Amino acid sequence: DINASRALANVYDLPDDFFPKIDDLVRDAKDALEPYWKSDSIKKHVLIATHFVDLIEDFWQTTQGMHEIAESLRAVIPPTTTPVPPGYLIQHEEAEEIPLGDLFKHQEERIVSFQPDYPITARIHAHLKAYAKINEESLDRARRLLWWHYNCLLWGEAQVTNYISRLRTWLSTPEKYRGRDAPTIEAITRP
Amino acid sequence: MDINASRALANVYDLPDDFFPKIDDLVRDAKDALEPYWKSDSIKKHVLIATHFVDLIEDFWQTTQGMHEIAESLRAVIPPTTTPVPPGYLIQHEEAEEIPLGDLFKHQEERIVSFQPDYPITARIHAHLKAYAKINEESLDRARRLLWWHYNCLLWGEAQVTNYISRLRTWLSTPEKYRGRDAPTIEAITRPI
Amino acid sequence: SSSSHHRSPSPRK
Amino acid sequence: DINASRALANVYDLPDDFFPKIDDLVRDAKDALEPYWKSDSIKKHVLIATHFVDLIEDFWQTTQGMHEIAESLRAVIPPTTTPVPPGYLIQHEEAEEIPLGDLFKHQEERIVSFQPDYPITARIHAHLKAYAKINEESLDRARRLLWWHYNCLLWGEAQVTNYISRLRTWLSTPEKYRGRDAPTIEAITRPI
Amino acid sequence: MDINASRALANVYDLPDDFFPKIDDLVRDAKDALEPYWKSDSIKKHVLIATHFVDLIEDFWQTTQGMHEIAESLRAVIPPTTTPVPPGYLIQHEEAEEIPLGDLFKHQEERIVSFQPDYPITARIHAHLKAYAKINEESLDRARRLLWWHYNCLLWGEAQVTNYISRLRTWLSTPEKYRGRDAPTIEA
Amino acid sequence: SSSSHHRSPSPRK
Numbered sequence: 001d002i003n004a005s006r007a008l009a010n011v012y013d014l015p016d017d018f019f020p021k022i023d024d025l026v027r028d029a030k031d032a033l034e035p036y037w038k039s040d041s042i043k044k045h046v047l048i049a050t051h052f053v054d055l056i057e058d059f060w061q062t063t064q065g066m067h068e069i070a071e072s073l074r075a076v077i078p079p080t081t082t083p084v085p086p087g088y089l090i091q092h093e094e095a096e097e098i099p100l101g102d103l104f105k106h107q108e109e110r111i112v113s114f115q116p117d118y119p120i121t122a123r124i125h126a127h128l129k130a131y132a133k134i135n136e137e138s139l140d141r142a143r144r145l146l147w148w149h150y151n152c153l154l155w156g157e158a159q160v161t162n163y164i165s166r167l168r169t170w171l172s173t174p175e176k177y178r179g180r181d182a183p184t185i186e187a188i189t190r191p
Numbered sequence: 192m193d194i195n196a197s198r199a200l201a202n203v204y205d206l207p208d209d210f211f212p213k214i215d216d217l218v219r220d221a222k223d224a225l226e227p228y229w230k231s232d233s234i235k236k237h238v239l240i241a242t243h244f245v246d247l248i249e250d251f252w253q254t255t256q257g258m259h260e261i262a263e264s265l266r267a268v269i270p271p272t273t274t275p276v277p278p279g280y281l282i283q284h285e286e287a288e289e290i291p292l293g294d295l296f297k298h299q300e301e302r303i304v305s306f307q308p309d310y311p312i313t314a315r316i317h318a319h320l321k322a323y324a325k326i327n328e329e330s331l332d333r334a335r336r337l338l339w340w341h342y343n344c345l346l347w348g349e350a351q352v353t354n355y356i357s358r359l360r361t362w363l364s365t366p367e368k369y370r371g372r373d374a375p376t377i378e379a380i381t382r383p384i
Numbered sequence: 385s386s387s388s389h390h391r392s393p394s395p396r397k
Numbered sequence: 398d399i400n401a402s403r404a405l406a407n408v409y410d411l412p413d414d415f416f417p418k419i420d421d422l423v424r425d426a427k428d429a430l431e432p433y434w435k436s437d438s439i440k441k442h443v444l445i446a447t448h449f450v451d452l453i454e455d456f457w458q459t460t461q462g463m464h465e466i467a468e469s470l471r472a473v474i475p476p477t478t479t480p481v482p483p484g485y486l487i488q489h490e491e492a493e494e495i496p497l498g499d500l501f502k503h504q505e506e507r508i509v510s511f512q513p514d515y516p517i518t519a520r521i522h523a524h525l526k527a528y529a530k531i532n533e534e535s536l537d538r539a540r541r542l543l544w545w546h547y548n549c550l551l552w553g554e555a556q557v558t559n560y561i562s563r564l565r566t567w568l569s570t571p572e573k574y575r576g577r578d579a580p581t582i583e584a585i586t587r588p589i
Numbered sequence: 590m591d592i593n594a595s596r597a598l599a600n601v602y603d604l605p606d607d608f609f610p611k612i613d614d615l616v617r618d619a620k621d622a623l624e625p626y627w628k629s630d631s632i633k634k635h636v637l638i639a640t641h642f643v644d645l646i647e648d649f650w651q652t653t654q655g656m657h658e659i660a661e662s663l664r665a666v667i668p669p670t671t672t673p674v675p676p677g678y679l680i681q682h683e684e685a686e687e688i689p690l691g692d693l694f695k696h697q698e699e700r701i702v703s704f705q706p707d708y709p710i711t712a713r714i715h716a717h718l719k720a721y722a723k724i725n726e727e728s729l730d731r732a733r734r735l736l737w738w739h740y741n742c743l744l745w746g747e748a749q750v751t752n753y754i755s756r757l758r759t760w761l762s763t764p765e766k767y768r769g770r771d772a773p774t775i776e777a
Numbered sequence: 778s779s780s781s782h783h784r785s786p787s788p789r790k
Contacts, residue, residue: 419690420689420690420691423690439634441632441637444634444637444638445637445641448638448641448642449641452645453690454686454690455682455724455725455728456649456725456728457690458685458688458690458691458693458724459693459721459724459725461690461691461692461693461694462693462694462697462717462721463656463721465694466694466714466717466718469710469713469714470710470714472710473710473711489648492648492651493647495651496613497612497613497616497646497647497650497651498612498613498650498651498654499654500651500652500654500655501654501655501658501659504655517662517663517666518711520662521659521662521663521714524655524659525659528652528655528656531648531651531652532648532649532652535648535649
């Protein structure tokens with residue numbers, strides 16, 4: 001639907017701070033999709049949510065670990081080693097262009113193409129950074145889509161896409177003519 | 192073929208991992224065969240499932256293989272035979288759910304230190320990377336299996352796919368001498384008009 | 385009398 | 398038909414030894430098509446098959462002669478001249494995207510970008526190898542399509558499709574869940 | 590003017606080989622006009638034949654012209670005056686269609702050594718390439734003419750294109766003074 | 778009366 005796609009894109013663009021803590025998001029999603037699991041239902045939102053939940057719950061911890069590893073490695077690489085410039089590393093598009101696997105060799109020939117003589121301790125840092133970038137992009141997209149599909153399953157597509165729009169508008173406008181407080185789904189707060 | 196038994200068998204995970212084709216041509220044929228439903232904007236269950244798993248693989252398999260290769264290149268650098276590799280102390284997929292999302296490296300290095308306080312930073316990195324790569328590889332194997340399953344189902348029906356795998360397993364469990372001179376397949380018929 | 389495909393796919397035995 | 402597209406892809410994906418030799422293929426294709434020519438029919442398979450036969454009869458000889466001329470120039474090339482590596486040899490997709498005319502100049506600038514000065518003989522050798530590669534790709538596609546349409550004409554389309562699917566599946570299995578005998582042409586030979 | 594005579598005069602191969610358009614423009618126009626029927630997955634006679642000829646044209650022509658320029662370079666760096674080229678001994682398509690599809694090169698070598706058994710390797714190569722170029726060029730000219738024919742037939746119609754071509758020839762025959770400044774067109 | 782195409786297209790004279 002056109003309004004649904006509008007809300008979906010506006011979600012994709014959202015400021016990343018209104019999305020709740022991923023931990024509680026996942027906990028509530030896998031606590032609220034349990035009944036449909038027991039009932040074997042196959043609704044669209046149910047499928048997408050119970051799949052992105054598995055994806056996140058499987059690949060978020062390792063990505064955060066990779067980031068921590070890269071941050072620990074930056075401290076131990078020898079100093080003034082001329083860090084790799086941003087944009088030269090393999091990104092998502094050329095990555096998915098590369099066939100499955102055989103990407104480490106491409107990153108390696110790329111890092112040597114910029115600096116033939118580069119310590120392995122920093123080649124590893126660059127590789128980890130470039131991998132975690134892709135992982136985090138995909139996982140953020142998944143988090144967003146999960147929040148959307150889940151809140152839609154809870155309240156209704158045509159009741160959440162009339163909140164995404166109000167929020168987008170109030171969020172673009174400047175502060176003076178937009179009241180003082182943001183809009184919420186009155187069904188949450190109504191006595 | 193007692194339909195109940197046939198259904199209770201033929202669970203995808205009951206496959207030796209040699210039957211599935213390579214990931215490359217697997218995803219290739221999956222895309223080339225589900226593109227019609229994509230362009231026609233289908234909503235079918237199996238289509239959705241194959242699409243999700245295809246995106247998952249296409250996004251994360253590259254990075255998992257890269258992490259394996261990084262573990263290798265790093266083992267090529269670690270102090271040789273100066274650091275006994277600790278098994279078991281590292282956490283596999285099962286204990287992952289208990290750990291909150293994020294702060295996994297915290298627990299991992301905490302255990303590594305409880306094992307060897309003087310553990311060199313580099314071998315520490317290698318252990319972390321190998322553990323994470325195993326965690327991802329298990330789930331990617333699962334996703335590959337489910338993708339093959341949902342794809343062959345989209346093609347030939349779950350009633351026929353589960354009836355085929357069932358026959359395949361009870362064939363593999365039949366001695367190579369008395370199996371016969373044929374293998375159970377899935378018929379792909381096209382009668383004329 | 386189907387298999388225990390709780391979600392759309394089939395889970396472990 | 399989606400099944401026809403599947404069959405075309407399957408044909409494009411085959412071991413390249415399952416097909417018969419060009420000589421006998423063209424022989425029996427003409428021997429089975431001549432009557433439709435004399436009767437002035439326009440069946441799709443007839444059209445495609447006769448056009449592909451004309452193509453092959455017109456270009457396979459020249460392609461093979463080109464290969465042999467390359468192998469003969471390799472006897473006069475100065476020794477240990479470092480034959481050009483791939484990547485500096487234009488392939489089919491680049492040949493398709495580059496304008497219809499003046500392909501030799503692009504190949505020349507590419508080989509000189511690889512090595513600034515390069516002997517005329519080895520230049521010729523590389524040019525011929527690339528051109529013959531392109532022609533061979535095209536003629537392989539043509540041979541496959543010709544066998545497909547000719548056997549489709551002589552034994553219907555459905556049976557050929559069934560056989561092709563069965564055989565491609567038999568080939569795409571890891572030798573352990575396959576059998577001990579590949580599906581044989583008798584399948585389409587017989588009626589149904 | 591009259592239908593039977595117009596139908597018996599119309600034969601693409603009667604054209605002067607210059608009224609035809611440029612190959613690249615022709616191919617571009619044919620591709621752009623077939624794209625719709627392609628996506629519709631039709632089975633029309635003209636569509637099939639035209640797409641086949643277009644594929645042939647975009648794959649062979651490039652290698653054909655390439656071969657020509659290669660032979661030209663070899664002649665430029667051949668023994669300049671010595672080793673005069675063999676006139677007419679080279680085989681054309683009418684003969685090449687007879688030899689098996691494997692060993693045209695052997696028969697060409699036989700012809701060359703028959704004319705002269707003491708002939709340099711590079712001149713040998715240049716001659717072989719020139720002959721192959723002539724063969725492929727004849728075939729590609731036929732292909733171009735058939736492509737133009739079927740393209741315009743698909744666009745307008747065979748009844749119209751035939752009558753049109755008939756008028757074109759009857760205008761080429763007339764003298765430049767008493768003919769029209771311009772040649773006719775389709776849909777007149 | 779029509780020039781029946783020997784092959785699918787129009788051949789030479």
